[PDB]
Amino acid sequence: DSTECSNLLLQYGSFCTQLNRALTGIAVEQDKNTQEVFAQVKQIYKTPP
Amino acid sequence: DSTECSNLLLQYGSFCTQLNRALTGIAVEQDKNTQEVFAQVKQIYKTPPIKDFGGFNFSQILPDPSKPSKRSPIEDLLFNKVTNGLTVLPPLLTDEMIAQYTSALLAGTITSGWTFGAGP
Amino acid sequence: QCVNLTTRTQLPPAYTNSFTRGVYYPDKVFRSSVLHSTQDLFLPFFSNVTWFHAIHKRFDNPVLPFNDGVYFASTEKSNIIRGWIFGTTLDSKTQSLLIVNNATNVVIKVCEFQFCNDPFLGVYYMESEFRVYSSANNCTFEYVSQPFLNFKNLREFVFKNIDGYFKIYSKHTPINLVRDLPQGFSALEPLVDLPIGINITRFQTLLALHRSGWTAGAAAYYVGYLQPRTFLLKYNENGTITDAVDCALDPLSE
Amino acid sequence: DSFVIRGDEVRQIAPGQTGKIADYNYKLPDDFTGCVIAWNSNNLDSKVGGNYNYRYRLFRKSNLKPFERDISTEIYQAGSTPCNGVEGFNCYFPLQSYG
Amino acid sequence: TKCTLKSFTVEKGIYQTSNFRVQPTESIVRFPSTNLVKNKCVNFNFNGLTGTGVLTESNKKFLPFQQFGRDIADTTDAVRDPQTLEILDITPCSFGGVSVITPGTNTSNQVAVLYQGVNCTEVNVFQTRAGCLIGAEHVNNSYECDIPIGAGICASYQSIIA
Amino acid sequence: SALGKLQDVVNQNAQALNTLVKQLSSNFGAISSVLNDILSRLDPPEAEVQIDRLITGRLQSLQTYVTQQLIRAAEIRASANLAATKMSECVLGQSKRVD
Amino acid sequence: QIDRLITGRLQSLQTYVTQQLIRAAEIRASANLAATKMSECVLGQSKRVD
Numbered sequence: 001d002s003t004e005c006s007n008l009l010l011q012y013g014s015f016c017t018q019l020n021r022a023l024t025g026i027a028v029e030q031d032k033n034t035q036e037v038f039a040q041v042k043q044i045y046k047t048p049p
Numbered sequence: 050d051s052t053e054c055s056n057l058l059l060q061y062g063s064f065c066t067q068l069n070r071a072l073t074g075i076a077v078e079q080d081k082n083t084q085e086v087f088a089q090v091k092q093i094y095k096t097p098p099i100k101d102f103g104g105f106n107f108s109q110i111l112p113d114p115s116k117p118s119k120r121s122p123i124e125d126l127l128f129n130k131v132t133n134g135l136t137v138l139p140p141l142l143t144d145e146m147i148a149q150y151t152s153a154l155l156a157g158t159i160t161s162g163w164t165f166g167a168g169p
Numbered sequence: 170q171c172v173n174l175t176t177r178t179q180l181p182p183a184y185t186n187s188f189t190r191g192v193y194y195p196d197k198v199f200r201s202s203v204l205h206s207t208q209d210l211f212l213p214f215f216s217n218v219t220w221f222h223a224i225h226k227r228f229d230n231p232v233l234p235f236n237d238g239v240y241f242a243s244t245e246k247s248n249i250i251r252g253w254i255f256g257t258t259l260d261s262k263t264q265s266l267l268i269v270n271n272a273t274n275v276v277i278k279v280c281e282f283q284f285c286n287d288p289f290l291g292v293y294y295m296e297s298e299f300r301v302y303s304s305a306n307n308c309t310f311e312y313v314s315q316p317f318l319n320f321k322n323l324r325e326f327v328f329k330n331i332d333g334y335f336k337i338y339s340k341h342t343p344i345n346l347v348r349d350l351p352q353g354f355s356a357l358e359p360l361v362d363l364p365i366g367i368n369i370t371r372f373q374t375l376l377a378l379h380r381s382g383w384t385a386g387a388a389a390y391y392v393g394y395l396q397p398r399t400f401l402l403k404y405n406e407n408g409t410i411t412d413a414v415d416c417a418l419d420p421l422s423e
Numbered sequence: 424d425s426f427v428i429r430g431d432e433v434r435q436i437a438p439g440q441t442g443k444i445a446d447y448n449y450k451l452p453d454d455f456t457g458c459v460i461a462w463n464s465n466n467l468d469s470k471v472g473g474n475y476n477y478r479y480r481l482f483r484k485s486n487l488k489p490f491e492r493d494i495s496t497e498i499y500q501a502g503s504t505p506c507n508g509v510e511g512f513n514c515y516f517p518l519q520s521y522g
Numbered sequence: 523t524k525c526t527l528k529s530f531t532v533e534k535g536i537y538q539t540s541n542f543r544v545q546p547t548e549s550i551v552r553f554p555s556t557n558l559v560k561n562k563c564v565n566f567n568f569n570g571l572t573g574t575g576v577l578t579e580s581n582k583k584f585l586p587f588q589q590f591g592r593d594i595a596d597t598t599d600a601v602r603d604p605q606t607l608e609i610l611d612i613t614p615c616s617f618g619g620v621s622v623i624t625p626g627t628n629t630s631n632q633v634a635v636l637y638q639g640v641n642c643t644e645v646n647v648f649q650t651r652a653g654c655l656i657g658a659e660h661v662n663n664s665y666e667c668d669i670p671i672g673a674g675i676c677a678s679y680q681s682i683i684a
Numbered sequence: 685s686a687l688g689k690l691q692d693v694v695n696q697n698a699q700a701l702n703t704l705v706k707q708l709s710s711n712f713g714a715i716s717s718v719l720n721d722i723l724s725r726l727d728p729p730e731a732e733v734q735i736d737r738l739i740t741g742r743l744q745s746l747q748t749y750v751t752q753q754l755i756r757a758a759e760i761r762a763s764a765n766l767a768a769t770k771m772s773e774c775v776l777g778q779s780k781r782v783d
Numbered sequence: 784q785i786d787r788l789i790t791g792r793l794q795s796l797q798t799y800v801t802q803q804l805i806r807a808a809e810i811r812a813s814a815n816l817a818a819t820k821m822s823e824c825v826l827g828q829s830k831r832v833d
């Protein structure tokens with residue numbers, strides 16, 4: 001919450017944006033991985049009773 | 050172009066050589082990838098002039114003679130639908146040569162089936 | 170010479186919507202076919218802009234704060250609005266800025282004016298009446314320039330004071346709307362940068378009387394206040410700002 | 424390197440200093456290694472009538488290199504008028520003595 | 523190439539060895555001052571804005587307030603002369619990589635040089651899309667790729683042919 | 685959105701280049717991001733410090749860019765190896781592998 | 784002092800993001816393998832040995 005630290009951090013540019021974007025890419029990649037592995041059928045089948 | 054900056058930059062060593070070497074490795078890797086994907090045949094096969102394939106139509110995937118780029122209608126649509134010390138090196142295989150490789154693969158798989166992939 | 174105006178009618182000032190007005194060019198840089206994000210003192214979109222009237226008997230010359238900057242809009246016909254007063258105490262104790270546009274030219278003077286309570290210009294039915302200040306002793310900056318100027322004309326100005334530099338931005342718009350601010354977009358061109366170097370916290374609008382007592386011509390002006398915020402400006406192929414996005418207005422624009 | 428200077432000029436015998444004897448008498452490099460030694464010599468290097476035997480370069484066209492010595496007693500042109508080796512208006516001797 | 527690879531024997535191939543920058547021939551100052559020199563790589567100082575570039579006549583339509591033009595990357599790509607109100611594009615001076623195409627030193631000591639992304643008029647001269655190639659003769663015959671140059675162009679030894 | 689996979693790679697590469705060029709506008713704690721301004725405004729003892737701050741910031745930016753370029757190169761190489769496998773097994777023969 | 788803390792924490796965060804990207808590439812390769820096994824071993828009978 002230090003405003004002076006953030007003011008000094010703004011001198012370094014868009015490093016934080018790159019880190020956030022990389023983490024966002026990893027986060028959507030995990031959901032894509034689960035989607036590719038498990039969602040290979042569009043019909044929900046059931047066994048007979 | 051600052052001489053003083055370069056003199057101070059020499060104190061850090063061979064970082065610049067490492068970065069240039071890594072970028073060069075990536076640049077040659079892209080060409081190797083294109084060779085591995087598209088250059089799998091050493092014979093440039095061509096379709097017969099008469100397109101008598103027993104009712105099968107391949108006009109949308111074979112190269113169009115009317116187009117100067119010698120691309121298929123599908124390939125032409127695909128190409129239309131994709132839009133301080135930095136340099137961009139051109140790829141070793143141009144788009145017309147990659148299209149020629151795909152045309153050779155299409156001609157081989159249409160006229161010869163899977164035989165051209167395993168031998169003559 | 171000073172004259173008290175004692176025939177005014179008491180009425181509260183009005184408020185209206187800013188819509189998408191008050192956008193000015195942030196710098197002198199040409200940009201073409203680009204989207205540029207800038208953090209500067211801007212007027213927020215759809216903000217509450219204060220509305221003042223001049224009608225007959227309304228003559229609105231109150232004392233307003235300047236704050237970080239002032240957006241001044243004018244729905245004007247027949248040329249009543251003539252200039253502005255900037256300063257802190259508006260007397261000979263401090264140094265004040267005068268902007269006037271009389272019948273011949275535009276005059277900017279930075280002097281220690283002993284201002285009147287009701288500064289005004291006058292038109293006789295020709296201009297032969299000027300009562301703004303009673304004295305001017307120490308003058309540092311003088312600048313004489315060209316004339317800047319149903320309601321038919323829309324005048325937008327942006328006044329900013331940063332680092333001793335007074336930035337005035339201007340835009341002239343042909344309009345045909347009767348009462349309020351038209352809804353649309355018009356980027357304000359930079360008009361002048363003055364190295365005045367004086368403290369400004371209060372400002373005054375200068376009007377012109379019509380004499381044939383006195384009569385006030387039909388005019389209306391709007392005062393808005395600038396806040397530090399980010400805009401996304403769109404530059405077309407001709408280098409003109411054609412659209413803007415307020416980055417902190419709503420989540421869609423964010 | 425031995426010399427005699429003023430008492431306020433001992434801060435100028437240092438790397439990276441701006442000053443008068445730093446520019447026109449004795450310059451130290453930015454990568455200087457070593458020690459500067461200074462001690463008061465009012466009992467030895469001073470006279471009641473004025474010890475004028477120690478001189479400094481008041482006037483020069485350009486700043487020295489580090490470890491550069493200038494003993495050239497050529498005239499300086501401090502104005503638009505050329506001096507031609509002759510003192511005159513804006514033509515001064517570069518070496519002036521401490522009082 | 524031997525100095526760059528730190529070896530006295532160089533294998534067959536293309537090796538990035540240096541960087542070619544077109545040096546500023548003159549320095550130009552324009553204040554509200556020196557003469558205006560166009561179509562050359564010069565240093566420029568327009569109203570305190572310093573830089574290095576090639577000044578060309580521009581077709582841009584700067585409005586009166588506007589003075590110097592910036593591109594996408596906020597580099598000054600166009601500038602207005604403060605004395606004669608005309609617009610000039612500032613193209614960056616020609617820079618590129620210098621690559622040495624050679625066969626093995628066991629085979630031959632002949633080399634060719636490729637200036638990447640540099641036209642041949644700002645440096646056996648052959649203009650390719652990859653850049654300007656000096657020292658290799660261009661032939662109309664087509665062979666298999668031996669040393670890759672780029673943009674469909676390859677080099678071989680038979681003298682060095684491209 | 686049919687061709688999103690290629691457009692994603694093109695957008696990522698262009699965005700990485702734009703970010704790397706944009707990082708030059710940052711001063712990284714120095715007084716200015718322009719080398720000429722520092723060299724013309726300050727003496728070399730403090731200009732060396734300011735240039736050093738700019739050098740370390742730009743070098744960190746360039747190393748970061750090279751790092752994500754290598755990671756993306758690995759991803760593209762894996763995709764290209766998969767594409768070569770599909771070209772060998774689906775185009776040059778008939779594959780019994782499901783999906 | 785704050786600048787020293789900023790550069791240290793930024794270096795730590797860059798290191799963390801870089802190793803997370805490398806692990807993400809490894810997990811993506813494993814997930815692609817798992818999707819291949821799902822398609823070829825579960826949804827069909829595979830002639831591929833082991």
Ligand SMILES: *[C@@H]1O[C@H](CO)[C@@H](O[C@@H]2O[C@H](CO)[C@@H](O)[C@H](O)[C@H]2NC(C)=O)[C@H](O)[C@H]1NC(C)=O
Nearest residue numbers: 099100101102104105106107108109110113122
């Ligand atoms: C194969 O398919 C192509 C494309 O569908 C056919 O070309 C069409 O021919 C009709 C009749 O002359 C034209 O009206 C269409 O405009 C043509 N389409 C295109 C894209 O050219 C072609 O006739 C089919 N048959 C053969 C034997 O080639």
Ligand SMILES: *[C@@H]1O[C@H](CO)[C@@H](O[C@@H]2O[C@H](CO)[C@@H](O)[C@H](O)[C@H]2NC(C)=O)[C@H](O)[C@H]1NC(C)=O
Nearest residue numbers: 170171172173174175260284285286287288303
């Ligand atoms: C116009 O009205 C203003 C407001 O009443 C007058 O200003 C006052 O002047 C008297 C002079 O005796 C002062 O004592 C008051 O303190 C002033 N008030 C303010 C708020 O400044 C002004 O003098 C009037 N003009 C004329 C010409 O009489």
Ligand SMILES: *[C@@H]1O[C@H](CO)[C@@H](O)[C@H](O)[C@H]1NC(C)=O
Nearest residue numbers: 183184185186215216217218
């Ligand atoms: C503008 O402000 C006034 C009071 O200052 C308030 O009564 C009015 O509702 C406001 N208008 C809007 C649109 O918020």
Ligand SMILES: *[C@@H]1O[C@H](CO)[C@@H](O)[C@H](O)[C@H]1NC(C)=O
Nearest residue numbers: 269270271272273274276296
């Ligand atoms: C306008 O103001 C200027 C500056 O005081 C003055 O010289 C000029 O005569 C004025 N014009 C009229 C018509 O009053």
Ligand SMILES: *[C@@H]1O[C@H](CO)[C@@H](O)[C@H](O)[C@H]1NC(C)=O
Nearest residue numbers: 261262281305306307308309
């Ligand atoms: C301002 O004016 C007054 C009276 O005219 C004078 O006494 C004072 O010295 C002036 N100050 C300056 C800074 O000119």
Ligand SMILES: *[C@@H]1O[C@H](CO)[C@@H](O)[C@H](O)[C@H]1NC(C)=O
Nearest residue numbers: 256257258263367368369370
């Ligand atoms: C300007 O004036 C206001 C009120 O008179 C005061 O609070 C502020 O400190 C002044 N600023 C300067 C820079 O003098």
Ligand SMILES: *[C@@H]1O[C@H](CO)[C@@H](O)[C@H](O)[C@H]1NC(C)=O
Nearest residue numbers: 404405406407408409411583
């Ligand atoms: C840009 O200017 C040209 C003529 O110079 C005009 O035809 C075109 O419509 C303009 N573009 C816009 C968006 O106004």
